Amino acid sequence: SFANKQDPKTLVLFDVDGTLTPARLTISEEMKKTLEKLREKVVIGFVGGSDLSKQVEQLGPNVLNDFDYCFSENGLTAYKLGKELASQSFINWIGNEKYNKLVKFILRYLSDIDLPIRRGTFIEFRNGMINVSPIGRNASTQERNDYEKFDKQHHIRETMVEALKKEFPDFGLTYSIGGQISFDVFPTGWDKTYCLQHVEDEHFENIHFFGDKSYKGGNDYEIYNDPRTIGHAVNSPDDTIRILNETFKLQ
Amino acid sequence: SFANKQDPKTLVLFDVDGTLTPARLTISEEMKKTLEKLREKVVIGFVGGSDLSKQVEQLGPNVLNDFDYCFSENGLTAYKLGKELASQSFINWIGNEKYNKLVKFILRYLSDIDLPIRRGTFIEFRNGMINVSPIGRNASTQERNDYEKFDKQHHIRETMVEALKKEFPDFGLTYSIGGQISFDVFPTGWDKTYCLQHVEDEHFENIHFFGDKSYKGGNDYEIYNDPRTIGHAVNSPDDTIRILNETFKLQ
Ligand SMILES: [Cl-]
Ligand SMILES: [Mg+2]
Ligand SMILES: [Mg+2]
Ligand SMILES: [Mg+2]
Ligand SMILES: [Mg+2]
Numbered sequence: 001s002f003a004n005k006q007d008p009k010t011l012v013l014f015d016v017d018g019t020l021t022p023a024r025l026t027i028s029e030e031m032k033k034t035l036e037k038l039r040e041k042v043v044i045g046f047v048g049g050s051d052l053s054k055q056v057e058q059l060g061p062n063v064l065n066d067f068d069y070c071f072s073e074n075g076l077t078a079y080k081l082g083k084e085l086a087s088q089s090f091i092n093w094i095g096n097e098k099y100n101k102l103v104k105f106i107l108r109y110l111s112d113i114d115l116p117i118r119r120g121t122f123i124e125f126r127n128g129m130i131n132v133s134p135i136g137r138n139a140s141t142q143e144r145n146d147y148e149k150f151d152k153q154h155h156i157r158e159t160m161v162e163a164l165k166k167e168f169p170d171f172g173l174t175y176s177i178g179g180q181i182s183f184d185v186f187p188t189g190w191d192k193t194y195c196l197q198h199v200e201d202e203h204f205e206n207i208h209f210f211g212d213k214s215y216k217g218g219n220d221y222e223i224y225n226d227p228r229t230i231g232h233a234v235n236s237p238d239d240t241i242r243i244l245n246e247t248f249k250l251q
Numbered sequence: 252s253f254a255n256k257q258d259p260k261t262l263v264l265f266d267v268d269g270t271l272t273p274a275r276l277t278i279s280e281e282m283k284k285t286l287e288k289l290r291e292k293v294v295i296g297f298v299g300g301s302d303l304s305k306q307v308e309q310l311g312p313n314v315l316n317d318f319d320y321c322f323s324e325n326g327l328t329a330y331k332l333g334k335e336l337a338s339q340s341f342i343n344w345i346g347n348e349k350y351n352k353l354v355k356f357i358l359r360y361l362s363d364i365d366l367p368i369r370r371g372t373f374i375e376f377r378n379g380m381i382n383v384s385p386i387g388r389n390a391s392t393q394e395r396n397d398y399e400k401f402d403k404q405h406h407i408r409e410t411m412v413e414a415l416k417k418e419f420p421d422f423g424l425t426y427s428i429g430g431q432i433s434f435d436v437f438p439t440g441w442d443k444t445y446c447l448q449h450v451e452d453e454h455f456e457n458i459h460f461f462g463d464k465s466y467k468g469g470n471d472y473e474i475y476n477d478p479r480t481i482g483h484a485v486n487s488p489d490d491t492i493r494i495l496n497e498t499f500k501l502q
Contacts, residue, residue, distance in 0.1 A: 169338045172347050188346025197352075227421055 001081075002068070002202070006041045011204045012248075013069070015192070015211035015220050016048035019234055021058045031237050035066065037250050043204070045069025047195045049219055051127065052077060073128045075195025085198055089127045093187055098171060102130075102185075105167055109160060110134060116150070117143055129186035134160065139181060148180040157183050178217075192223035206230060208247075210240050253319060257292040262455045263499075264320070266443070266471050267299035269463035270485055272309050282488050286317070288501045294455070296320025298446045300470055302378060303328060324379045326446025336449055340378050344438055349422060353436075356418055357383060360411060367401065368394055380437035385411065390432060399431040408434050443474035457481060459498075461491055 002008045014020045020035075021027045038044055045067050048055055052072040056063055064070055070079035078085040091099055103123065110122055119136035131137070134156050135147040151157055161175045161183060174190075177183040192211075199207065209229040211220030224231035234240045244250060253259040265271050271286075272278045289295055296318045299306055303323045307314055315321060321330035329336040342350055354374060361373055364385070371389035375382040382388070385407050386398040402408055412426045412434060427435040443462075450458065460480040462471030475482035483498075485491045496502055 166335065166338060169340070169343065172343065174346070187348070189348030194348070225421075 002043060004040070005043065008043065009205040010042040010208070011069075011199060011202070011206070012038060012042055012044050012208040012210070012244075013071075013195070013223075013229070014044075014046045014209075014240070015213070016046050016050075016055055016058050018212035018236075019210050019240055020046065020237060022237060026057065027059055028237055031241060032060075032066070034241050034244055034250065038244055038248055039068065041248055041250075043068045043202075045071060045199075047071035047075055047192050047223070049074055049128075049192070052079075069195075069199065071195035071198070074190060074192050075198055076128050076190070078195065078198045080198070090129060090186065090190075091125075094171070098168075102168065102171070105164070106132060109163060113156065113160075115156070117147060119143065128190050129184050131182050131184055132160070133182035135181050137182065144180045151181075192219060193226050196223070196226065196228055208232060210234055210243070212236075253294050256290070256294060259294055260455055261293040261457045261459070262320075262450060262453075263289065263293050263295050263459040263461070263495075264322075264446070264474070264480070265295075265297045265491070266460075266462040266464070267297050267301070267306060267309055269487070270461050270471075270491055271297065271488060273488060277308070278310050279488060282492065283311075283317070285492055285495055285501060289495055289499055290319070292499050292501075294319045294453075296322060296450075298322035298326060298443050298474070300325050300379075300443070320446075320450065322443075322446035322449065325441060325443050326449055327379050327441070329446065329449045331449070341380055341437065341441075342376075345422070349419075353381075353419065353422070356415070360414060361385060364407070364411075366407070368398060370394065375433075379441055380435050382433050382435055383411070384433035386432050388433065395431045402432075443470060444477050447474070447477065447479055459483060461485055461494070463487070463490075 017024070020031055035044055046055070046059065046069070048071070050073065052063070052070070055072060060066065064079050064082035068081065072078070076088045106123060113134065115134055117135055117139070119138040121137035122133055124131040124137055133139075134151075135143065139147060157177050161177060164175065164185070172187055173185050174188045175183055175185055196207070207229045209220070209223050210232045211224055212234050214220040214224035214231060214233045223229060224233065232243055234243065268275065271282055286295060297306070297310070297320070299322070301323065303314075303321075306321070306323060311317060315330055315333045319332055322328075327339045329338075345353075357374055366385055368386055368390070370387035373384055373387045375384075375388055384390075385402075386394065390398060408428050412428060415426065415436070423439055424436055425439045427437070429435065447458070458480045460471070460474050461483045462469075462475050463485050465471040465475035465482060465484045474480060475484065483494055485494070
């Protein structure tokens, strides 16, 4: 319930990796007691781009009872008070019919272009997106370096993205070219801000967000700068703890 | 590539309705002849706020091969020498996540206010905009006259537009209250100047624009006054004919 909190009208959301935990490690004991004390005053929750099976590694096994809200895959999978609230996936949203046209088009497109180096894992299917690589994610470190230079000279990914946009003008997808070898395809607005529709029915006066990659291009950018949140940029769990202690007057 | 024309560095863009054609009707054969003569000298194109399905009625069946540039819906759909250059829609630009929040808010807002007369078609979804009417576009002629007086006394549309701006401050939308019953909602800058980005790669030294509603509030105002264009205000195709013949030395 939301009955035993000094401010049942304030929610604090946390990016997981690098905000509640170190850069690639598990959560500290002081952070857990800090959250436990924070939960006494306000509603707390987390949001991360990975699934619940990756966040248990970072946050612990008893995660559904540690946070009032648990947002996995940017909120595609959501829990409230430890009960499932909603589940959504890319394939459920787009449907198999459209996804089969999309895959067949991409497979044909890749078979027709001229590449000097091909490897494998040209399409990686994920729960909230697909990733498309003309050379393939199985390229070695050096093959990825080489492809990046080839792609800068011949604009392979850019041209493929434009071909996809014109072939599927009504699919509602966003395309993001990033890194050395690939681009992301996902429904517009399926970033960390996705999770906020899940808390709307509580009509909080304030929604705080803490994240370590709020810069341009980071996966906290959209939700930090969202009008529904008060953003707090951090660089470590230590910053998170320092800010929490003063802001919510923890003892 | 327009290497055949006498001066491929000069583009001439035309508004359609009232500039190339009469008030609301077909294009004359003399205008067609004038354009083809003009086509041999300069790069020509048109820009109109309607979709292809209307301009094919105003300009003719092979409109696609009658102009070097065909800009429908202010250029959201673009053709270059009969080649598809770009395609864009309101829903593709905003995305379903944001559009669903916008619609849900409008439906709830309308359900909460007190109106004497309600009908239907409160939200009209269009390819370049939505139109929102508190009484609804299914209102009869007299019901629209009655609502205009009610709205002028109570400022229903004005209050609703301000509520929309406060709720969605980062949606990048323009609101236009006009007529008796409704207001338009469209992405900022989606006027006839939107098409100018589609010709930016050729770097024309002169882009003429002809328009019959270049006055304040008319749909030609922005592109006529744009610093990239040389504007020519007209009142009928006969004016357009007269100016083209002397300026480009036709006949
Ligand atoms: Cl593959
Ligand atoms: Mg992080
Ligand atoms: Mg913010
Ligand atoms: Mg006109
Ligand atoms: Mg001008």
